[PDB]
Subunit: 315 residues, 4 copies
Amino acid sequence: VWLANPERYGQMQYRYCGKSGLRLPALSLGLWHNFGHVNALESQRAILRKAFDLGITHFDLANNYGPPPGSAEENFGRLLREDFAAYRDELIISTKAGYDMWPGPYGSGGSRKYLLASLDQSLKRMGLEYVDIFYSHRVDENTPMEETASALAHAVQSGKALYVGISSYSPERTQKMVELLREWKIPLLIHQPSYNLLNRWVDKSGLLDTLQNNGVGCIAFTPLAQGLLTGKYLLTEANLNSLRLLNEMAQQRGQSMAQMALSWLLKDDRVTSVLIGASRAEQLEENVQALNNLTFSTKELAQIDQHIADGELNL
Amino acid sequence: VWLANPERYGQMQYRYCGKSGLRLPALSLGLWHNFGHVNALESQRAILRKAFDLGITHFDLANNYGPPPGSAEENFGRLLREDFAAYRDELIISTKAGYDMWPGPYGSGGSRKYLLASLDQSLKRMGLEYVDIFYSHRVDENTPMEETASALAHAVQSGKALYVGISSYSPERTQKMVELLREWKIPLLIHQPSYNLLNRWVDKSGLLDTLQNNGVGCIAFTPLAQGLLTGKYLLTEANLNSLRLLNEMAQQRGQSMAQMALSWLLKDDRVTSVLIGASRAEQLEENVQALNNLTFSTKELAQIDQHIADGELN
Amino acid sequence: VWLANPERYGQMQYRYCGKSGLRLPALSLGLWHNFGHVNALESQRAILRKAFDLGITHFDLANNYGPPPGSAEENFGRLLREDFAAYRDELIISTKAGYDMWPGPYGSGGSRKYLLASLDQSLKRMGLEYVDIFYSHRVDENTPMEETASALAHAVQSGKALYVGISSYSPERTQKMVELLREWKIPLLIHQPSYNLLNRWVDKSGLLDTLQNNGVGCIAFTPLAQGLLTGKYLMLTEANLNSLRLLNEMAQQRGQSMAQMALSWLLKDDRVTSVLIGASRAEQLEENVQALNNLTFSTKELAQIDQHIADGELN
Amino acid sequence: VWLANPERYGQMQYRYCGKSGLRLPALSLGLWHNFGHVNALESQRAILRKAFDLGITHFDLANNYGPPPGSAEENFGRLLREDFAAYRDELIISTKAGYDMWPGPYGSGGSRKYLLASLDQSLKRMGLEYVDIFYSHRVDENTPMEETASALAHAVQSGKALYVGISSYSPERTQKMVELLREWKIPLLIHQPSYNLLNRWVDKSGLLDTLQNNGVGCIAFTPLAQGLLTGKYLTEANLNSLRLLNEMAQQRGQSMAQMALSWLLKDDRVTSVLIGASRAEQLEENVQALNNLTFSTKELAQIDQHIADGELN
Ligand SMILES: [Mg+2]
Ligand SMILES: [Mg+2]
Ligand SMILES: [Mg+2]
Ligand SMILES: [Mg+2]
Ligand SMILES: [Mg+2]
């Protein structure tokens, strides 16, 4: 019998997701790694318990997370049953379909066949009646967006998803999805782009403007650029020199490199949340302290950008 | 085996709820207090049985009623199983979501997540396939009403609620909710404001007009002003003085103070029902007698208001 | 094990119901009487089996048929399970709600509460997943027809009724229900009025114009005027009886019983989809279906029939 | 325990169905014959396993396939449970209602009663929660198309079919069905007409254009004209011209059947051809039609002349 920390909601910051009434914690837990069959369940159990004890109420999955595919959803489902039976209505659970999941022409893409069959598979693996958010995981240029939208719509109408999201859609395609969903009287809840210090496509492309204009939230995937924006590597000598200079700016702020990278994303109120792909419980404890310093000077932002340019860190 | 009073429908007055074809008893039972795990089930049983024997067919609940939260729904569900198994289709059962119910950001307010997870919890606690009326229990300024309305609409489309209501919404927000639900071809059935002799926000604000203009019914919550209108207290000296003068008017009518307060709400067609929160069976027998004198003269209505103004009883 | 007549579809006439693709037998069986707990089930069984062996595929019920109320549905459900388990998809089963069924304010009228609670009760009594036609049984002036229509629409969308009907609605109210159901993209299937030789409200009112203009079928209730148009009575006046005697003489000249002529008269053209026969024994069905052998009337005969009705004051 | 061929997706060609995102294999398996209660289940099993091993992921049924009616659905359902329990999400399974299925006024045609009762029967026989495509199997001139379309829409909204199709509808009635389903926000996925070298109503009539303009797929039923466009073989004149067509196939390095299938698949106007195989080896043979999908103008003219001259229509 496990009792979550009674003070779990006392320190975490929650942000409304776009124009919706749904509040996400400013850091959410992603299950892309660390939750497959290659990872001991004991380590997974410690990560989920620590996340919820820190107030992290959103756990982001996809059909193909593991490895092998599906196994993150299976393991999460087991841990939900063991440790979170009383707490499911305090959690926001997502999953997704769009990348390669199972073999053959219906195991990938944006088709109604793949999306609705995959959703049914994910619900069965996780042992849930519904997910809080179902995403289209990526753009399928070969399926008309009307088909994809109408599948997202069916998942909501049929009670298998409370809300729907998209991931890695351009501003123009985001706009079209919002309009198509509005035909079914469903607001697009949320967009999940890759977004961090080193990958600024969402600001350059004007995605953040499209999202605010349509009241859609934004949750940053790979906010730590897969370990580049942590202590980890402290590729080219110029890259590393600029990473060292960024780490010095973080130290000036009393922050770790990772904390500053997360604070940097959470400086825009147009970012709803940042997805932390934590591999041990201590990482969550350290990352959430980013919330202690969310302001940057003009000079700081200019210097950050200048170090990124110098080191050619825009990969 | 319990057999309800065969004459239960013979005396109660029923009112159509706004423009709808649903008839509510002019007095309904509210379960805000008295039905928690802190109250013995035998006392609850005797209240529910008496209410139905008097023709009271509408039982009003909300997710957080108890204490603790959820326990009034649980206890009601047990009693429905034990005593009302043959009668469920003779009852109108409501519940609601909006106030704090469970910890964290999804346990309060107007979101789709909270309303729909809460409704599922309530149906499970009560052992019901659906409720007859599902409410948004209060305004959430931080959820768009489009979202709250769509969640109510989903509850109806999916067969978990027959009708929908709102509680404590301004006239402007109530109008907007009527419009938003009409986009789903669902009429807003009912609004549950606080309304009694001493608190007439619904009238001054224009809400009663908004409800009639849209065919929405009105069920008065705290019609006895939480004891102020029962002579429980017979507060400033001028308050107390005006309460005693009100009680004298009641006595001139052959009524208790509680009975006059209820008759006053029921004096015309602007109120569908008044929600009585009984702690014992006898209170119900006494309150339903209000129906024997629903008439007030112009002079009586003026003198009531004068006493209230004089005592600053607003 | 009971095997229905292999030749059952060979002689019955079927009529498309209004503009729809649903074909009703020109004679249907109604369970208004003879199917209550006051009637032995062996008698009921003989009636249903005979009906179906004659090609009568439409069995018309209502929540309150018995007595007591609901017992016709229960008895029918038992016989369906015992004798018609392989034949349900060959049957058109209807039920209704609108008259007094259970005590109190939700047990009568047109409200969404009553209609939807009642349809659940009926499906449980009959042991069916759905009925083929669900009716509003009568007008409720105190429920808006938008509420009654929405209730019927919900029965269809939820899969508990394939089609919907109304009974005893005026032309103007019929037209409104058609428009209201069309907002849900549902056509009104059918109208069940009382209609027979002695009761021509449907003609005189304009109902038959409304039904044709909107493609709604018409199923005649009490086509034998509760025994007035049979052998039974040959309180009624001497003038009434004299005219009924002369009508029976007309029937005999056509080689028909009075009941057969009364049924042929309704079915003489395409304004009536079916006539509801309320048989109390198997033989009655055999006799009534033979009305189909003579559906033609001359202009002189029609005028003569009306004259005897006027002379005898039989309206 | 049966393990499908790991290389099954490596050679088959898949075509997007109309404007949709659903990819059908260029050859699909039809179960019109060979899957009845008159056919041993071991032979059916070998056929379905071979199909899937070749990458044929679409299996096309209808209520009344057998004989007796319903039996193809029942047998396919058994083989799905035995051999394809892990693979159902890789399959596209259709069924249909429209022709004579059961006795009486509700057992044929286009009515909501028939289509929805029939789909429930088909799901039960097959042991499926839903089919991937549900068809109206033929035109019913006595049911308003609004009724048929609404019943197809209900099958989709209720989760009993992912997509909807029609079969043997004129271009005018096709166009009407597309419009009616669009009122329900459902795209017509696919049309299944009879189409082969000897039967070109779909081209003559304007249908292929109607399908193209509305983004609807086209799957050819009886692509081998019921054995006429194979080795198998009614007049002396007919037989003469079938001999000559066979020579043209031999020039291309094809059997008559391979050429007849290549001819349908020669351009993008056909999504798939429905093969009704009676033994596994036929499928191995027919799939090689994909090796040669090109025809010169001279071949195309010569084919047509042999058919003209032989009376083959
Ligand atoms: Mg696994
Ligand atoms: Mg364990
Ligand atoms: Mg007990
Ligand atoms: Mg028996
Ligand atoms: Mg076997």
